[PDB]
Design an enzyme around this catalytic site. Sequence first.
Site, short mmCIF file in Angstrom:
data_model
loop_
_atom_site.label_atom_id
_atom_site.label_comp_id
_atom_site.label_asym_id
_atom_site.label_seq_id
_atom_site.Cartn_x
_atom_site.Cartn_y
_atom_site.Cartn_z
N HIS A 139 0.81 -1.20 0.00
CA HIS A 139 0.00 0.00 0.00
C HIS A 139 0.86 1.27 0.00
CE1 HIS A 139 -3.33 2.45 2.12
NE2 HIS A 139 -3.47 2.46 0.82
N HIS A 143 1.00 3.93 -3.58
CA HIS A 143 0.78 5.37 -3.55
C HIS A 143 1.99 6.15 -3.95
CE1 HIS A 143 -3.31 6.00 -1.95
NE2 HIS A 143 -3.07 4.87 -1.34
N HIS A 170 -8.16 0.10 -4.68
CA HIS A 170 -8.90 0.18 -3.43
C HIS A 170 -10.14 -0.69 -3.41
CE1 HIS A 170 -5.96 3.36 -3.38
NE2 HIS A 170 -6.13 3.26 -2.09
N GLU A 275 -10.55 11.02 -5.12
CA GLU A 275 -9.38 10.85 -4.25
C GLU A 275 -8.89 12.20 -3.76
OE1 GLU A 275 -5.52 9.85 -6.10
OE2 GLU A 275 -4.84 9.12 -4.19
N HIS A 290 -11.97 11.47 -0.46
CA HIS A 290 -11.26 10.31 0.08
C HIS A 290 -10.14 10.67 1.04
CE1 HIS A 290 -7.56 7.80 -0.38
NE2 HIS A 290 -8.41 6.86 -0.07
N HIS A 294 -9.61 10.16 5.49
CA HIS A 294 -8.44 9.62 6.15
C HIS A 294 -7.93 10.53 7.28
CE1 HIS A 294 -6.54 6.07 4.26
NE2 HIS A 294 -7.23 6.47 3.21
N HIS A 330 -13.55 2.96 2.72
CA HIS A 330 -13.32 2.65 1.32
C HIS A 330 -14.45 1.91 0.64
CE1 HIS A 330 -9.42 4.27 2.22
NE2 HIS A 330 -9.28 4.24 0.92
CU LIG Z 1 -7.60 5.49 1.00
CU LIG Z 2 -4.64 3.95 -0.35
#
Ligand SMILES: [Cu+2]
Ligand SMILES: [Cu+2]
Length: 573
Positions: A139, A143, A170, A275, A290, A294, A330
Site C-alpha cells: 500500500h 501510492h 482500493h 481521491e 477520500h 483519512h 473505502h
Molecule cells: Cu484510501
Molecule cells: Cu490507499
Amino acid sequence: TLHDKQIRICHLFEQLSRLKNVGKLQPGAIFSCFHPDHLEEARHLYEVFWEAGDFNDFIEIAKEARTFVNEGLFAFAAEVAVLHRDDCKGLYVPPVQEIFPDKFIPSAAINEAFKKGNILDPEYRLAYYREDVGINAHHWHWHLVYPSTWNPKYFGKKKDRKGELFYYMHQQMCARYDCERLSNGMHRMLPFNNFDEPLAGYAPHLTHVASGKYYSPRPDGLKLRDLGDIEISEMVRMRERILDSIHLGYVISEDGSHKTLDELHGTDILGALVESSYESVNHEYYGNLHNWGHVTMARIHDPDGRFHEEPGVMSDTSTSLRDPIFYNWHRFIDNIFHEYKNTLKPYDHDVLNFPDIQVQDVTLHARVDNVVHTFMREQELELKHGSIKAKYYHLDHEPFSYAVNVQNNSASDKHATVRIFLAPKYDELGNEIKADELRRTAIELDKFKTDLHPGKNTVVRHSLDSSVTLSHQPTFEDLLSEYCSCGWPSHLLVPKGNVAGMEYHLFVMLTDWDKDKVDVACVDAVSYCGARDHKYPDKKPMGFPFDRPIHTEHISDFLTNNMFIKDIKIKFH
Ligand SMILES: [Cu+2]
Ligand SMILES: [Cu+2]
C-alpha cells in the site's frame, strides 16, 4: 544499476529516526500521506530531488536534507525520486518494513529487544490480513508509484489511467477483505455512509521510536468532528456534488464548462476528483473527499490539536490497512464509483464473446485437485537498519497451477488474454451470492497472454507467475519482472477459507488480445501496479467483466463460451 549506486541509495535510508521551503514539519512527528500541507512539503522535496543535475548531486542534497527534515517525509520523497529518475533506473529501494520496523512490528516486541493475552473482539480474527507486513508495505509503494500530487506537465509525462487505478486498487483491497470476513464466518463490511455514525475503535500498539511517541488509539464511540482545516459538513457537500454529476452524466470544469462522463474515461475522471489528485477537473468544487476522510478519522481523538496527540494509523499508507474503519471508509468510496458504473449499460454478448474459442474445462492442480490449502507460516524481520530479528506469522497457501482446456474452432492461430478471478459461492449464512453481488467480491488472480493454435489447447499457468503479486523483495542485506517494490504479497494471493473448506468460484475468461493490447520494466504485478513508463497494457476496464451491472440472477447464466466457472474449495490448517 551498478552495485555502487545501489549501496549509496541503501545508505540514504539507513537509520532514519535550495532547501529553503522544506523543513516545515518537525522530525519525530508522524507524516501524513493524506493531509494537504504535509504532501506539499513532500512534493517540494521530491521536486528538488528530480531537478538535481545528476546522481552525484541527487545523493548530495538528499544526504543533506535527511539531517534536518522529517524522516517520513524524506522516505516518501526519496522513494518517488528513485522510482522516477532516469539515472536510478535499475535500482531497488530497500524494504519499508526495514527502514521503519516500528510501523510493522508491535510496540512490545520492539521494546522487548532494544539492546535487549486472550481475545475479546471478533475483529482480531482478521488481524492476519489487515496487519500483514507485506500488504501494508504494498500500500505504501502503490501510492508512491501513483501519488495524488503528481503534476503531469512538471514531469513531462502522464501516469496512465491513474484515477481508474486508484478506484480499482482500493475496490480490490475491500473485495479481498470481505473474502476474509466471509472466510471467518462474518458478514460483509458495511459502508460508512452516514457521517454522523459513531466509529468503532482500534488500538494500533505501534510506537514511533524516533520520538518516543505513538500512533494514537481510537476508543469506541467517537463521531467525526470538525478539524481546524476542514468541517464535516464540507465533506457531505463534496459527496453530494459528486453524486449530482454522476446522475447527470457530466462533470463541471473550473471554467464552468461541462466534461462528459463517457464510458472510456469516466472512471478515470471520477477517480481523479474523488481521491483528489492534481488532475481533478475542479478541486474548488468537488474537493478532496477520500483524502479528507483519512485525515478526519486519523485525528478524531484530537480534532483541534489541544491534546498534542499524534494521528492514528489512518494518516499513513504503511499503516492504514490495519484499522477496520479503513474498509468502512473505502466501501463508502467504492460505492461512489459503483453508483457511476450502474449508469452504464450491461455488456453485450458481442463484447464478452470471443467467437471461435470455447473454454471446455479448467482444473486447479495442487496436492488434492481443485482444493487449495492455506496455513500460518513464520518469517523473521531484520530490525538493525532502521535491535536484530523479530518473528511473526502470516497466511500462506500451497503452490498450484491452472490447466485450462481451450478449443480453437478457427482454422488459424488466435492470441488470447486469460483473465482469472475468484469469488465466494455463499455468504456467512449459507446463501448463494447472486451475480450482481459477486461484482463487489470478485478478486483478480491473474492476467496473461497465451497463444492458441487450432483445435485443442491446454494452457498451464503457475500461481507463482501471478500478475497480481510481487515475486521478489530483496532485503537490505541483499542489496548490501524487475526493480520496483509495488505488488500484492505472494502469500496473500488467495483467501484463508475455513477448516471445513470454503467454496469459491474460479472464473476464467479468454478475450481477444488483439483488441486488448496497448502497444517495459516492472510488470511483475501489472494488474494492480501497472507498468513502468508505459501505459496500462490492457484496454479493457479494470475489473472486466465485473464492472458494469449484470442483470442475470445466477452467474452461470451470465457465461458465454469463452468463460468457465470451476468450483474449488480453499481449506485452512
Ligand atoms: Cu484510501
Ligand atoms: Cu490507499
